[PDB]
Amino acid sequence: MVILGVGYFLLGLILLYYGSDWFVLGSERIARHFNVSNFVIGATVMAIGTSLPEILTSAYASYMHAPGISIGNAIGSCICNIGLVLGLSAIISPIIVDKNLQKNILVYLLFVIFAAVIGIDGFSWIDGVVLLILFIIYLRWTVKNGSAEIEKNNPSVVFSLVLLIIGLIGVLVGAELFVDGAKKIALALDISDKVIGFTLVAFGTSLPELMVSLAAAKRNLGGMVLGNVIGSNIADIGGALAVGSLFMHLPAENVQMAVLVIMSLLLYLFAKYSKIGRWQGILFLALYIIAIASLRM
Ligand SMILES: [Ca+2]
Ligand SMILES: [Ca+2]
Numbered sequence: 234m235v236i237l238g239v240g241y242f243l244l245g246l247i248l249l250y251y252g253s254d255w256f257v258l259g260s261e262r263i264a265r266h267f268n269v270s271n272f273v274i275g276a277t278v279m280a281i282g283t284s285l286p287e288i289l290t291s292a293y294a295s296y297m298h299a300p301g302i303s304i305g306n307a308i309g310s311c312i313c314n315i316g317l318v319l320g321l322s323a324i325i326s327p328i329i330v331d332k333n334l335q336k337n338i339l340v341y342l343l344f345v346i347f348a349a350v351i352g353i354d355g356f357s358w359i360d361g362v363v364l365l366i367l368f369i370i371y372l373r374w375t376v377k378n379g380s381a382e383i384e385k386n387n388p389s390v391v392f393s394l395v396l397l398i399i400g401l402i403g404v405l406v407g408a409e410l411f412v413d414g415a416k417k418i419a420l421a422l423d424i425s426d427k428v429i430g431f432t433l434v435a436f437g438t439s440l441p442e443l444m445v446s447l448a449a450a451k452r453n454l455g456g457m458v459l460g461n462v463i464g465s466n467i468a469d470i471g472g473a474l475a476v477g478s479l480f481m482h483l484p485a486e487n488v489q490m491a492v493l494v495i496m497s498l499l500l501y502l503f504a505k506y507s508k509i510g511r512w513q514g515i516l517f518l519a520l521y522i523i524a525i526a527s528l529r530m
């Protein structure tokens with residue numbers, strides 16, 4: 234059963250690779266269909282789609298009386314999205330942020346700071362309710378500001394939705410096969426360790442974002458990348474973390490929240506006063522490496 238683990242592992246990689254490109258291509262077409270920016274489609278449809286693992290994971294974990302895993306994933310994902318995911322993407326395709334997209338990033342920063350402050354004493358179910366509402370407000374605010382009001386079953390639209398949906402299924406299934414495949418290899422080789430069993434799943438929920446953003450970066454879709462990262466973080470907090478708090482009070486993670494706030498602030502400052510390019514990406518990656526080397530497992 235080690236061969237089937239390798240089977241799942243490689244097949245997961247194949248589905249992630251091609252699925253992410255299809256998802257990106259389908260999303261880019263849908264953006265042009267609805268007359269919205271790539272940032273908007275990245276921050277809404279793409280972000281929610283790729284944060285489905287986090288939401289399910291956080292909800293399940295907190296339900297199973299493991300609220301540390303719930304908030305643990307979620308904040309961990311946010312750090313991964315800025316540090317690793319945006320870091321790699323910025324180097325591949327440097328981004329100069331337009332003024333009204335800078336506005337969206339600022340709102341994101343305020344959201345993260347607000348979440349951090351109310352999370353100092355942990356996250357109650359009331360905290361979750363508030364975050365979820367802000368999450369909803371953010372989505373509507375984002376769509377409208379990035380929408381161009383203008384107006385059968387056109388083959389261009391249908392094929393667009395097919396690419397998106399099948400692409401999304403490809404990255405989600407691919408991510409599961411990757412994790413399950415790796416988990417069965419490790420079990421077959423008796424090197425299985427649940428202390429690292431969670432870093433495999435935590436990173437696993439971040440695999441769709443990683444592959445999607447890289448694919449978009451390869452096609453110079455910087456707005457989509459930034460949208461995906463910003464939207465996924467908010468979805469991780471206002472969605473994944475929030476739902477977790479509904480089942481059980483989530484323990485405070487003040488160190489990790491502080492790290493996220495600092496990384497979010499840096500992201501805003503770079504977007505506002507400079508660019509998100511090679512050296513900003515290098516800094517993000519360096520910080521991420523420092524985080525995974527120092528933060529508690
Ligand atoms: Ca995810
Ligand atoms: Ca609280």
Ligand SMILES: [Cl-]
Nearest residue numbers: 271454455456
């Ligand atoms: Cl773009």
Ligand code: NA
Nearest residue numbers: 280283284465
């Ligand atoms: Na996401």
